[model samples]
Target: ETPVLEKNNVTLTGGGENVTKELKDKFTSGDFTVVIKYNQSSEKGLQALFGISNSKPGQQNSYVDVFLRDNGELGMEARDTSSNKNNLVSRPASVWGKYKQEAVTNTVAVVADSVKKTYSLYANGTKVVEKKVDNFLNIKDIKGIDYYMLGGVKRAGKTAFGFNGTLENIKFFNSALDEETVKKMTTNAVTGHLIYTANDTTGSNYFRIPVLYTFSNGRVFSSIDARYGGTHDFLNKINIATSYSDDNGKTWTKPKLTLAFDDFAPVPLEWPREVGGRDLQISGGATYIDSVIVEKKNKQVLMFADVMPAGVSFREATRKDSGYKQIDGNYYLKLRKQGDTDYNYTIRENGTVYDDRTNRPTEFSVDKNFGIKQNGNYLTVEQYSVSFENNKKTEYRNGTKVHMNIFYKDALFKVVPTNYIAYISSNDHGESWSAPTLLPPIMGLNRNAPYLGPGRGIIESSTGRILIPSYTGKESAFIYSDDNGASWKVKVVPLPSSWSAEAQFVELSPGVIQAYMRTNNGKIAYLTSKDAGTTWSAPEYLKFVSNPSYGTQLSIINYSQLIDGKKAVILSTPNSTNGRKHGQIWIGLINDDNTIDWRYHHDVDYSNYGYSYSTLTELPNHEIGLMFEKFDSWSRNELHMKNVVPYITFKIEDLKKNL
Candidate 1:
């Protein structure tokens, strides 16, 4: 006959429930299986779900139990005092708390087989870890085994490793269960609490560079890089996708392509998923990457992104030209006609293409989207489609024609092969936006535009200047607008090292702003600007938050709520020395003297989970909204993972830890 099974459901707060009577002599055969369904009230500490122990005085280390840790590591421990034997096995980031504000129901199982001398752990119906022990100690083998309890292990007449959660249902079987039975018993799926998923109606298989913002109208806005042809940064088609929430971040609208090019059809295509295979770049397409957003005092929302032409990449683009020329004190987008050696033509008033030497207009014209027109008719070019089979790329004519954008290399007129920054304004609080406006050559005609911030920009309160963070690979070139989005300028602050800088700004006081950025030295650096970004102090590294040398972008924003009766700033970044993992949110109190008191911090997910390129915004109800890449984009082993970017919310009290 089968051994009797003991089942219990208990809400564990501090002390445990004694179950010695029900489980007495249940493990005499030295084999057992325990399955548990639980929801944790807290995601911290090494808490045990149940334990079988020797409750005799002085026998503190004789027990067997399954445990959970704050880092989402599920583990099991077995010990015997008489033989002085111990065993432990764990799986990282396999269980609860993907989002702090969401409740996650987890089902876990632990099995021990005496004959096989093995111990195994299962979470959500999947076997995560298994260990073959030298001497598999059983519950019956433990010395003075007279106690059994739920919610903690009993040692030396005391309950230890107390759990802080609700045990929905727990089953104890005196017989070790097979893998299939264990899997069927623990069938619950893991949750990431994702807001954006892959291969949806968005026609993009992968996404990265997430940005979140709370509008003045109590609506939450989100934008991301809708990357096609894999997660490669260049030589591929990328569009800026946007979505909004009306009732504060509870629900979102479908993603819409706002800033995109029609040179390539934005269709979903499966790219290679292997390590070296995923690194393959598509041949060519017009792209817009790295988005930034800010709202003016007049409530006109402005968005910025870096625009790339077909076949042009950051490494391949010309750095010596701004793709514009000054004619009669006004800047015009200069271009070269087909077979022309010098750029002696420019697109001027009323979309007229003028021959600079003759001061005469040609039949050629440019439209708002940069489409070239001849005699008021758009010049069309054949569209191409891409496909991959067995990790090989093939291009074919898709029998569709599209307008010839001036950025296209084969167009009648083409801009220089350098990158440029463009902006669009929304007067209706992000419901609609104006036409794209390219920033004037603020760095002059001799230099290219700076790489834009992938996060939000800032508007200084005292000076009323709009500050948009940017970098030139060697310095921080913060773009500003003094006339309330009428005209813009740039302040180029050179850094000590030529690092690939991606920055976000936070206002500490009325005129004091701090620029936190990524550096090549595996540390997050900051530079202070007292004169409203006209000048900046030297770079200083943050004592906390050091990641891989190939750093990821971070987000920082001023919080309206006061902590400890002082102003606060929240920062989101990965704090790992290895790959991008350990997403953490830090709260820094702005002291009266303007010095930051780096007070509290809380981890977003498991310490081993991926966290890269994060954005933070304060919600309408005083909560913090965050959207981040949930995988290590830098790891070759983690390529082509879809729906890895997720949105999670936090409260001010949740981050007030580590005091």
Candidate 2:
């Protein structure tokens, strides 16, 4: 008879009702496949199975059983069916019980093939125990029964070895499944999946800004901002471009525009234009146009670009006079919406200034009035009136007078406001482009919004949820997309300080994730989230790397594939106190208990070439790919070198050698 059995819900509840339905036939035992779904719910003490054993309460070794340990280890003891026995198989670190009491739906399956005289046990679909017992015992020796009661023993009168948790569909097959089928089943049971970079071009500018990903169609997609020609900042103007290597990094096609438009003129002023004889800075511009490529559930590739307009000096612009006055000898580029034909601003030699209410020259103003107050000591008012006449005293002068009034409006020389970052999406994998959608301005009136560091946005392993890291002046916020960047919503967790943190997220394990950030006092800060990336815990410090007081960006990827058979995280950053000098990559191995064990670090370069804004991705052959600015790109002096972005790749073995 072909008796079929399968777990009802693929999970078992422990310490509630441990039920195991057995089919006990007389003497003709050919081979029996018994699959049990069980879990541990009680932390104090609980066992899901006790085969032919009896244990009194409080006795150290009162029961002879094969069961899971509280710490998720698998163990089996066989003594005098009545007294304590020696353990036949015990793996202290084996994944036995659930790590959380809430994880009470673990599955355990045992297959006894009498024909092969082999017994194997599987925990969560992974084979943990397999024994070739030549003298396999038959079911008739224990009991000649047809149907056994659930949660009870196999023997006639024994009641002390009853299970306590909930049990669902119990199956007893007549034959053992083949190795291939068993392997497939095991893979199906493990839910977490990861994708590596397909084709990595280390030094190629056509495939820069490496953002690697895997699609559900078993195709590897490495989406990069393939910037070629022109200076650094000007390269970004060459239409947002990308390339793909269908053969997994072995070769790649030429760059294509994920999104491209030349409607707006090139930003007139390159970054680091002079202001007050000191080179004012505009940085994180070219490299800041990092693109996130995501494949939706329908297999349509969507690319998201976080792009800031160029020529907006960030460091030196200050507020002055009654309105925001640009410092002398500085330049600014004004942007008009693409479709708005009538209204357009002008780029001036001394910064973009708005025409006054009557079309006269007037500087932009950002004033905050405290209140009406009296300054008794030094009160001075200044006014100017303009009059136009046809002739000198020829006729009664009729003048249209324009008055300029100045008061304490609390103004200083301020930077031009270019806080709105543009976003664009591509449906085909970087083949064509869509019209740009400007992201809402994140910087408020009195604050400066700097560019975020480099890295590809992350997609959750199980749920395919996407998280994009962003920050305001004070704290970091995550903009998430559930429909593959069609729309976005900001997550509400603001980071600690406004100016001191750079945050990124990584999935350490199934249902476990972490977000690491740079702290104010040079500490690597971290936060935890259990329910994917929806919510996070308070920020804490990680003991691995010390962030300089100026802070650093974090680029980490949980490369779920094995490196020499160990899972690892490819984390890239400048791991030095010498101001972005020593760029390094660290491989952190994830422990079974959801903790990080850093395995090795590969120092990519140890020069004062000045590395910051680094990104890391695992290449197709398990190698690592990195892209970073070859200078302190954020510094005032270096911001002008819009041609300094470089891409680098390293082997895992090379990193392991350094470690």
Candidate with the greatest lDDT versus the true structure: 1
Q: Whole-model Cα lDDT per candidate?
A: 0.85, 0.46
Can you write out model 2's per-residue Cα lDDT over 12-41, one digit (the tens) per residue? 233122333443331245445555555434
Give the per-residue lDDT of model 1 (tens digit) for 1-659.
24355465688885889988888886768788899998888767779999899888878889999998765668899999879898887655457565554557889999999888899998876566676789688777787888889999998888888998889889888878999889788876443345565666578888889999988889899999999887778888999999888876888888888898877888777776544776788887888999999988998999999999888999989999999999999999999888989998999998899999998999999988899899999999877788876557887768888899887755878898899999999999888988898899999899999999799988899989999999999988899989998999999988888878999999998889999999989999999988888888989899987788889899999999889999999999999998888989999999888889999998887677677789999999999998888677787756655556767778788888788
lDDT of 2: 0.46
Model 1 C-alpha lDDT versus the unseen true structure: 0.85
Q: Which stretches of candidate 1 lie over 4 Å from their true place?
A: 1-98, 101-103, 106-192
Instruction: State the weakest 10-residue window (summed lDDT) of model 1.
Output: 188-197
Q: Could you say which candidate leads in TM-score?
A: 1
TM-score per model over all chains: 0.76, 0.47
Model 1 quality (TM-score): 0.76
